[PDB]
Amino acid sequence: MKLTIIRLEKFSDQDRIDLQKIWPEYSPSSLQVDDNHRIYAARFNERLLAAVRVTLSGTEGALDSLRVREVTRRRGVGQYLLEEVLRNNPGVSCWWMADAGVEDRGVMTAFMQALGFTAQQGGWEKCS
Amino acid sequence: MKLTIIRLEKFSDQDRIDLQKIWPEYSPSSLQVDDNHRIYAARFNERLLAAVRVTLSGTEGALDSLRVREVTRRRGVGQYLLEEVLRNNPGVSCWWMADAGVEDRGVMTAFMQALGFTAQQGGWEKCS
Amino acid sequence: MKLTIIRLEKFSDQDRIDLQKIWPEYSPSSLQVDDNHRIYAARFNERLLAAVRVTLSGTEGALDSLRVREVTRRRGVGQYLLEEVLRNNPGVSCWWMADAGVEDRGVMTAFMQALGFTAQQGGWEKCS
Amino acid sequence: MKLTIIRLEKFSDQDRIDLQKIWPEYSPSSLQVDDNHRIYAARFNERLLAAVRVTLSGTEGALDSLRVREVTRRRGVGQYLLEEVLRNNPGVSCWWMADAGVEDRGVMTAFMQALGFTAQQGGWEKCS
Amino acid sequence: XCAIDQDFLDAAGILENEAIDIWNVTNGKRFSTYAIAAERGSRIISVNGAAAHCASVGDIVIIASFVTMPDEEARTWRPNVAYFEGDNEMKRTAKAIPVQVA
Amino acid sequence: XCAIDQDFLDAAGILENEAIDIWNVTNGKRFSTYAIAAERGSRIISVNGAAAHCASVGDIVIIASFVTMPDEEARTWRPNVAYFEGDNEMKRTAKAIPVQVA
Amino acid sequence: XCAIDQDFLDAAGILENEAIDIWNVTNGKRFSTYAIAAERGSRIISVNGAAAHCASVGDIVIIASFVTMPDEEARTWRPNVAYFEGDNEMKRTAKAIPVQVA
Amino acid sequence: XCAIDQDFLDAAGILENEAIDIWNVTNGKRFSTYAIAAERGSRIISVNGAAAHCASVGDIVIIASFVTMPDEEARTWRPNVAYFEGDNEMKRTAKAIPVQVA
Amino acid sequence: MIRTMLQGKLHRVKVTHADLHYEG
Amino acid sequence: MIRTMLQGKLHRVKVTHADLHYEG
Amino acid sequence: MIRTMLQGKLHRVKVTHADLHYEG
Amino acid sequence: MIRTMLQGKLHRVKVTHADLHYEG
Ligand SMILES: CC(=O)SCCNC(=O)CCNC(=O)[C@H](O)C(C)(C)COP(=O)(O)OP(=O)(O)OC[C@H]1O[C@@H](n2cnc3c(N)ncnc32)[C@H](O)[C@@H]1OP(=O)(O)O
Ligand SMILES: CC(=O)SCCNC(=O)CCNC(=O)[C@H](O)C(C)(C)COP(=O)(O)OP(=O)(O)OC[C@H]1O[C@@H](n2cnc3c(N)ncnc32)[C@H](O)[C@@H]1OP(=O)(O)O
Ligand SMILES: CC(=O)SCCNC(=O)CCNC(=O)[C@H](O)C(C)(C)COP(=O)(O)OP(=O)(O)OC[C@H]1O[C@@H](n2cnc3c(N)ncnc32)[C@H](O)[C@@H]1OP(=O)(O)O
Ligand SMILES: CC(=O)SCCNC(=O)CCNC(=O)[C@H](O)C(C)(C)COP(=O)(O)OP(=O)(O)OC[C@H]1O[C@@H](n2cnc3c(N)ncnc32)[C@H](O)[C@@H]1OP(=O)(O)O
Ligand SMILES: [C]
Ligand SMILES: [C]
Ligand SMILES: [C]
Ligand SMILES: [C]
Ligand SMILES: [Mg+2]
Ligand SMILES: [Mg+2]
Ligand SMILES: [Mg+2]
Ligand SMILES: [Mg+2]
């Protein structure tokens, strides 16, 4: 099906395959989720193309481990993923993402600014 | 079906719906017609797009309440409506339309002149 | 069927209709043919578009009454008609056509010269 | 089928027809083949378009009688034929083709140089 | 394919030898061919050659042609529309299709 | 044909009177026609005239238009894609299709 | 796909690798492909690959190509028409189709 | 729709978002769509959406694109042809189709 | 960027002749 | 050299009306 | 404004070969 | 005068996936 953002609470075999491509650093084994520690992913034609981890603390939220697979970049996947995480967590008024682990801060900062975030010391912030 | 001009003598439920969109000022209830007080309408794909009231006095005729729905303007609907009213009443040698109630006289006067009428004091006239 | 040149020896009802359009001057009644007095016609989609009369005198031949219907001119009908009359009468070494009855000698002379004839006093000639 | 290079060990009736067009100088009768005297051909839609004779002497190989039918030249047939002869005889490190019998050395030398051969006295050489 | 009365070609802006699409309301077939001229005033619509597998006498069809142009001119383009009833009697010509409303 | 809500035309960049291709997911039929406008906000997708032989009410379709341009501009072109669910509720607009991965 | 004797390509003005439409008078099928060259003088019309589902040996077809040009040049354009009978014997070449009359 | 390994697009000169024709040797169906990219190296040929009514897994197809250019350049144009066998293993690339001979 | 637009149409004409043997 | 490209699309709209008598 | 015109045609040629295995 | 020419082709590729629910 068309590009769709999903909250993953249970992982299929294929989700595990795909998450290992998105995040080779992580064992899908230790991707534990609960109500305040979430995984959102972008699905297209039965495969995950991107994912991000979300930590909720009421009005404050944090993003980590955002990654779109290399092969499908610059086609709006990351933008849609983050738009839907924000839209689906309307109680969060201030979002933060650290700059830890990013492949290229120049690329990441252009993407985060296009998504309405402001570059700050150590990362990017979006408050309403 | 294709754009068609009709003389309405009986009103269907859908004609009443459509005439209320064309003329919000009027209750379809008090749109009485007879041989000398007529309603002509433009029909397209089972809906009325425009209408006009016609008062016949033998060789003299009067037009009032001409209106084409906003969404379908500048596509020849009004022109065809008035051409067919004139063609279907060949005994009328002088037509009159007052300028009462017109949204924009500048638009109406360009339309009436394109239809062969001459701008006069208080309205537009077409004599053969 | 496609444009085809035929020698007419028998006339159908429709051939008579069509020849009256091609030649309003003639009664199809008095279009008698024999081995040395022939009629050739151009047929297209079951109708005759053009015709000519041919008089054979062994090595000498004469053309008269050449006419292509007005509606189908300047589409190669006349050229094909005359090419096939010549090709089907290879024993004729000198052809003549008079200028009698031609609608416009300027048009006829451009056509006959395109067909390889030379303009002469009183008509056009083609010798091999 | 699509253009395909084949090693001919047995000749069909149609292969004999086609080889007589490719090589009118030769009787297909005296086109004897064995492991070190081979014929390769280019096949397209059930016909042979080109052929060459190959003589193997271990690390040394010789090409003779290369010809693509005239009608299908300058469409990559000869290039594919020689590429596949070389690829299918990887034990050969030095190839030679004489200039005997060539229709136009200027054409042949442009073709052989495009195939990686160097023009030498008496022919063309390719060593790895 | 299709031979068409020259007057009808003129009314729709279609040229002799132009590519045309034919959409058959009677049987649903859709095909593409080119325009042949028929005698002015004859009212002929003649489906000829291989195209005769796609229509019968009496079938009701729409015959269309398409042109290309830059985006800016396309936004203000007006098509040449001609409407027929009965035995190919031309009822109206126009330069726009109305908006379909609810 | 096909009359289409003007808002949907706008979202896909399709013009009134433009050639369109219609691909029917429900029945597999594929046909070509042109765009008629429907009233903004009506949500209408109306398959009209001969085209009504190719679709039924409730069928799910993709409606596409195509444009031409030089090779160099084609390499960086971004199509205007609009996605619908339910009763023609527009879910998303975008400017690219993702890459399908193994 | 369709491989065609080069002489026939030349007579119709069709190029090797050009898009062509094929209209089958025998079975009514209509399809589009591209021209492959066949040896000059061979008289070959070879329907190849997937296109072989659309024709049989002996079927009678029309093969056409289409070109684009501005309106003004289109009004005076002359198509390259070639007519065949029997075993692909070329009967005539021309630059116009006649008018069909009543 | 059709998602195609990017390497195969490159070999045939086909662009992402370009119009393509698909001719199915297995079942004879012929249809037109546009190219979606698939991951480089995946060997994918994925017939998606309404187009899935026109093909099955394992079917053998030809995928083509067409371009326009002036007559003079068309006479010397060289198409980008790529040939596959087995499980989408690319055998050869070329710039011409041979002449079919008697 | 070049668009393909409806140039014109003949709406609901009636076929007068249908003949496999006609040109075509 | 001129390419034909997807300009835009409406993905998975639903037909609301299907009528042989409509224009067309 | 650009028109699409018939460039040329081969009228009533006869198919000599029809083969699924030919290129194509 | 503008011609339509074969730009390129993939000859005899094999379908790997056929799915009505895929985009499309
Ligand atoms: C364990 C862990 O993951 S640690 C975290 C590691 N993560 C990383 O290192 C990030 C690696 N990079 C990526 O994943 C991607 O490049 C992302 C997430 C930054 C962007 O995702 P994409 O899907 O490619 O971005 P998308 O196409 O939605 O871009 C949206 C906008 O961002 C901007 N943008 C994105 N990429 C770029 C770029 N390379 N250069 C400039 N601007 C860019 C543009 O404004 C773009 O809009 P436009 O295309 O209309 O100009
Ligand atoms: C209770 C009651 O109704 S009281 C009466 C209230 N009525 C009104 O206030 C009238 C409101 N306006 C309308 O209904 C329409 O704008 C009308 C009737 C004036 C015109 O109807 P339309 O269908 O849009 O006109 P149509 O497309 O037939 O136009 C014909 C010609 O008129 C002229 N014309 C129409 N609208 C305009 C315009 N906005 N500006 C300039 N000329 C115009 C042009 O010459 C046009 O031909 P063209 O398009 O080839 O240039
Ligand atoms: C009872 C009786 O009939 S008496 C005889 C009465 N007959 C007449 O008055 C003749 C009336 N005119 C006609 O019938 C036609 O105009 C004919 C026979 C002269 C020509 O027939 P057509 O089919 O139109 O000619 P065709 O298309 O074959 O023309 C061939 C060539 O002739 C020349 N030609 C024909 N018409 C013209 C013309 N109007 N102007 C200039 N050259 C012309 C051209 O060289 C043309 O080739 P081109 O089109 O490649 O330039
Ligand atoms: C008994 C006997 O046979 S004796 C031997 C007799 N043989 C002969 O006399 C050879 C006759 N000639 C031929 O058979 C052909 O012309 C051959 C074999 C030389 C070439 O075969 P072709 O299939 O036409 O060559 P192909 O199309 O593969 O050409 C490959 C490259 O060679 C070069 N080339 C080929 N022909 C030419 C030419 N006429 N001019 C310039 N370069 C050429 C080009 O670099 C070409 O690549 P390009 O098309 O991308 O520019
Ligand atoms: C007409
Ligand atoms: C929309
Ligand atoms: C020919
Ligand atoms: C490839
Ligand atoms: Mg992306
Ligand atoms: Mg209007
Ligand atoms: Mg003529
Ligand atoms: Mg070659």
Coordinates of N, CA and C in Angstrom, one line a residue, chain D residues 1-3 44-46, chain K residues 17 19 21-24:
Chain D
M1 N 14.5 -15.7 -31.9 CA 15.0 -15.1 -30.6 C 16.0 -14.0 -30.8
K2 N 16.3 -13.3 -29.7 CA 17.2 -12.2 -29.7 C 18.6 -12.6 -30.3
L3 N 19.4 -11.7 -30.6 CA 20.7 -12.0 -31.2 C 21.5 -12.8 -30.1
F44 N 19.7 -14.7 -35.2 CA 18.6 -13.7 -34.8 C 17.3 -14.2 -35.5
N45 N 16.2 -14.4 -34.8 CA 15.0 -14.8 -35.4 C 15.1 -15.9 -36.4
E46 N 15.9 -17.0 -35.9 CA 16.0 -18.3 -36.6 C 16.9 -18.2 -37.9
Chain K
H17 N 4.8 -13.9 -41.0 CA 5.4 -14.7 -39.8 C 4.7 -14.2 -38.6
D19 N 5.4 -15.1 -34.5 CA 6.1 -16.1 -33.7 C 6.4 -15.4 -32.3
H21 N 8.3 -16.4 -30.1 CA 9.7 -16.6 -29.7 C 10.6 -15.6 -30.4
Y22 N 10.2 -14.9 -31.4 CA 11.0 -13.9 -32.1 C 11.1 -12.6 -31.3
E23 N 12.2 -11.9 -31.4 CA 12.3 -10.6 -30.9 C 11.5 -9.6 -31.7
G24 N 10.6 -8.8 -31.3 CA 10.2 -8.6 -29.8 C 10.9 -7.2 -29.3

